[PDB]
Design a protein around this ligand. Structure first.
Ligand SMILES: Cc1cc2nc3c(=O)[nH]c(=O)nc-3n(C[C@H](O)[C@H](O)[C@H](O)COP(=O)(O)OP(=O)(O)OC[C@H]3O[C@@H](n4cnc5c(N)ncnc54)[C@H](O)[C@@H]3O)c2cc1C
Ligand SMILES: NC(=O)c1ccc[n+]([C@@H]2O[C@H](COP(=O)([O-])OP(=O)(O)OC[C@@H]3O[C@@H](n4cnc5c(N)ncnc54)[C@H](OP(=O)(O)O)[C@@H]3O)[C@@H](O)[C@H]2O)c1
Length: 455
């Protein structure tokens, strides 16, 4: 009876567990999670208006309800239980704890009220408890987001969508309340490089172009000579560039020009600009603008980089969101860690020089893939682990699993959240959603959550 543990209950932890249980009929898989609830970025990252993307929770739930899987929420690995205790109790341990650290801008003014990471703002509208008191001031009229990836489009979309259109999503009631009073009417999404280097994808870009009540602001000068350079591009990429290109250059028909003219909100893309400093208001109490360094591109293909021209542009705004990526954080002394790439060093999921220790998801490869990318990568880890298990490369004989761990947690005063405990809060969140017309109304206060979890 192989005993395996998974650290982190996001898509990498759950897909790793699903592979292990599907391909080994006897193994037991225990999933540990620091938050009081499961699912990681599917609950706290994916936007409220992309409920379709969160449907993977139904298959994760079937895995967690199975006889050979168990969930242990409210357990911070590296703090409440160490990795070495886990290594001693299980045949294999898989690190799947994501990339919790936002990359900072590292620029002067970053401390002014009105500056936030995009993930923190997302965590605020998606109910991550640690961001419940973010209280972003939306009394300004313009927001600037740095970074042109899908996370940037999500934050811009939420700031500009007519609030009534978010009423039936699972967005927190607190954030929708704040959005109803927001004075933000313009959002600029700024990149250091040019149109060919954008990182967003077509579904999200189209949602922005078609967002009711808004008009797009693209400068045709940023697109001169584009069709020519995209003739040899991959199909999906070329389609994305053609949609941007049309949006920037085609003159709209009569009805669309009228719709654009009556729009009360607008969004735009700015290129060749890198963040130099956040500018304060006269009294220093808040952000009032962003000073950008003009840039030009050098290099070819993926090797292209932005270099400064010496010119600068000041762009007035009251909210600055940095959407420039993430890094994993070290977790425990027994686990090697590369501060440069912000990943646990590994060879196809086997942690360097640590027999029995593996990794999957963002902590294995870096923070760049979508959920499907995380799923197929976790299956790769699951294959190597099971081959190591079948071949007798892991310790032979028993291994206690949770019987050992719980006896340690019992003594330390840590009471883990089981999946059946989570089911109680889930039912409560869903029922509270019935009155208002939402999928659920998330509980945000950890104390109240613990009560509703039966703790
Ligand atoms: C803002 C945002 C929006 C996104 N939107 C989409 C989208 O629309 N579509 C899409 O396909 N992908 C989206 N993604 C990408 C998707 O979120 C990632 O592909 C996926 O969640 C990465 O999975 P993961 O399991 O590695 O990490 P995560 O999902 O982060 O999960 C890691 C888990 O480990 C837990 N953990 C951390 N530390 C510990 C510890 N010490 N002990 C125990 N547990 C711990 C975390 O709490 C968490 O639950 C988005 C990402 C972000 C940031
Ligand atoms: N629907 C979906 O499929 C979906 C939805 C949401 C999120 N996700 C995913 O989740 C992952 C995380 O996304 P993300 O938006 O944070 O990152 P991302 O997709 O990698 O884009 C972030 C970046 O910010 C820029 N950048 C980095 N440092 C900068 C600096 N100091 N100043 C200015 N710009 C800087 C980089 O652009 P440059 O290198 O040219 O400058 C890069 O584009 C992505 O892989 C995203 O696709 C997917």
């Amino acid at each position: 009876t192989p005993q395996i543990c998974v650290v982190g209950s996001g898509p990498a932890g759950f897909y790793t567990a699903q592979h292990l249980l599907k391909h080994h009929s006897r193994a037991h898989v225990d999933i540990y999670e620091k938050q009081l609830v499961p699912f990681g970025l599917v609950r706290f990252g994916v936007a409220p208006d992309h409920p379709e993307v969160k449907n993977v929770i139904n298959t994760f739930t079937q895995t967690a309800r199975s006889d050979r899987c168990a969930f242990y929420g409210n357990v911070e690995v590296g703090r409440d239980v160490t990795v070495q205790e886990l290594q001693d109790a299980y045949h294999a341990v898989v690190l799947s704890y994501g990339a919790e650290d936002h990359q900072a801008l590292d620029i002067p003014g970053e401390e002014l009220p009105g500056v936030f990471s995009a993930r923190a703002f997302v965590g605020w509208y998606n109910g991550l408890p640690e961001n419940r008191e973010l209280a972003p001031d939306l009394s300004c009229d313009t927001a600037v987001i740095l970074g042109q990836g899908n996370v940037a489009l999500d934050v811009a979309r939420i700031l500009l969508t007519p609030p009534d259109h978010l009423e039936k999503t699972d967005i927190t009631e607190a954030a929708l309340g704040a959005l109803r009073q927001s004075r933000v009417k313009t959002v600029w999404i700024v990149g250091r490089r040019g149109p060919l280097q954008v990182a967003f994808t077509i579904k999200e870009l189209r949602e922005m172009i078609q967002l009711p009540g808004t008009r797009p602001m693209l400068d045709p000068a940023d697109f001169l000579g584009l069709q020519d350079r995209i003739k040899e591009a991959a199909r999906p990429r070329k389609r994305l560039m053609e949609l941007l290109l049309r949006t920037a250059t085609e003159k709209p028909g009569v009805e669309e020009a009228a719709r654009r003219a009556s729009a009360s909100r607008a969004w735009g893309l700015r290129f060749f600009r890198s963040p130099q400093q956040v500018l304060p208001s006269p009294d220093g109490r808040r952000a009032a603008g962003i000073r950008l360094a003009v840039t030009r591109l050098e290099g070819i293909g993926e090797a292209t980089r932005a270099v400064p021209t010496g010119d600068v542009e000041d762009l007035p705004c009251g909210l600055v969101l940095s959407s420039i990526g993430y890094k994993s954080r070290p977790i425990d002394p027994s686990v090697p860690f590369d501060p440069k790439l912000g990943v646990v060093p590994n060879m196809e999921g086997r942690v360097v020089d640590v027999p029995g220790l593996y990794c999957s998801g963002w902590v294995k490869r870096g923070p760049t893939g979508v959920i499907t990318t995380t799923m197929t990568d976790s299956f790769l880890t699951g294959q190597i682990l099971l081959q190591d298990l079948k071949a007798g490369h892991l310790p032979s004989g028993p291994r206690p699993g949770s019987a050992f761990i719980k006896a340690l947690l019992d003594s330390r005063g840590v009471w883990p959240v089981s999946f059946s405990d989570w089911e109680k809060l889930d039912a409560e969140e869903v029922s509270r959603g019935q009155a208002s017309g939402k999928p659920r109304e998330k509980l945000l206060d950890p104390q109240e959550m613990l009560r509703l979890l039966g703790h």
